[PDB]
């Protein structure tokens, strides 16, 4: 049974970056050339691994981390980067091993009058740990006074909506991003390229 990569890439709807959905791939022969053959996946940045050699290595599990972000914030998705998404939504470790695959999705994700179904976290006490998810929608405290978990001055909802519109610039159009996160821990692997 072949692996579901193309199901992840062509999923009809992607998850919000703050609640970044994770799909786990295991016990399958993962052909990476075929996804690399789909050049319309414009961004193919890879770190801590050789993208070509993925077809030769084995891994215990591969996580298909899928979400949507603005085009300009795509730069924040990389090792050692900082900013809105890299801190409060999806922090990649500075020693990250894997690949990020991002492509413009304005043709489908963007809607007239904005697409607000995609949301991102921007307020938090500290940086997210690598691969940390935080769905907590509680009112974030930004001052001395506790504000009873109800929105008001100096205490805000930590999530904001992108509102993607079709006509925005390339740097601000939605970019569907799927991030391959790898695993190998003291046991025989399950996923192998060859």
């Amino acid at each position, epitope marked *: 049974n072949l692996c579901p990569f193309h199901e992840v890439f062509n999923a009809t709807t992607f998850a919000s970056v703050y609640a970044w959905n994770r799909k786990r791939i295991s016990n399958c022969v993962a052909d990476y050339s075929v996804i690399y053959n789909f050049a319309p996946f414009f961004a193919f940045k890879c770190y801590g691994v050789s993208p070509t050699k993925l077809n030769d290595l084995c891994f215990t599990n591969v996580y298909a981390d899928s979400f949507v972000i603005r085009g*300009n914030e795509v730069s924040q998705i990389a090792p050692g980067q*900082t*900013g*809105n998404i*890299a*801190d*409060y939504n999806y922090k990649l470790p500075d020693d990250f091993t894997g690949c990020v695959i991002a492509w413009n999705s304005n043709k489908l994700d963007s809607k007239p009058s904005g697409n607000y179904n995609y949301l991102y976290r*921007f*307020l*938090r*006490k*500290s*940086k997210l740990k690598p691969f940390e998810r935080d769905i907590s929608t509680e009112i*974030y*405290q*930004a*001052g*001395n*006074k506790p504000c009873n978990g109800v929105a008001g*001055p*100096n205490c*805000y909802s930590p999530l*904001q909506s992108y509102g993607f*519109r079709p*006509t*925005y*610039g*390339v*740097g*601000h159009q939605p970019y569907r991003v799927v991030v391959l996160s790898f695993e190998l821990l003291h046991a025989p692997a399950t996923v192998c390229g060859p």
Partner: antibody
Amino acid sequence: EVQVVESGGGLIQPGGSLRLSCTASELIISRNYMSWVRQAPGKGLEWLSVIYPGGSSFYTDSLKGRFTISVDNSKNTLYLQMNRLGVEDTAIYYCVRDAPSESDWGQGTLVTVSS
Amino acid sequence: EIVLTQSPATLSLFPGERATLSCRASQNIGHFLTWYQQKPGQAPRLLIYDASNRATGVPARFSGSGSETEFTLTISSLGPEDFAVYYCQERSDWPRGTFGQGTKVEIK
């Protein structure tokens, strides 16, 4: 209005260094987006630097390598270390908290780089 | 680098007149643009965020419009306090961004 007060601005010789200070009464500086913006006399505003709640900070290319931004969690202050100040740096430097629905500026402190 | 050309340099309206302030961007930045009010000798004050949304405490007379490369601040009626400088700042990397040269609201 939430009040933030700047301090530490004054006369300085060319080529010197300076540290501006900014304090917050109501809000917590460590838990907010804080930026420094200067307004040279009779000239437009120029955003200098920002520090995020998580400690991430950014600078303009015109100021990279000269200005540095830092915070104090216990005292609840924001600091801007300035190095190699020229005459053109003469400006009122503001401390501002930026939020999607709010922007709380202080009242600025003058920096005079002159002989 | 994104450069914003505010116009007119000076907007000499009589009090109570509607004030329209143009701010044009050299790049398509979407609606990520912010407008700041600034009384003389005082720190700026946020009016509009994302070019359309009025900030808290700002009177309803203020309103924003335009997108992408042509943005316009609209004051339905200039009050005496409204006679001040106004800056447009892009927010492509919020809260970062460059400012416009500003527009002065004074008649004589």
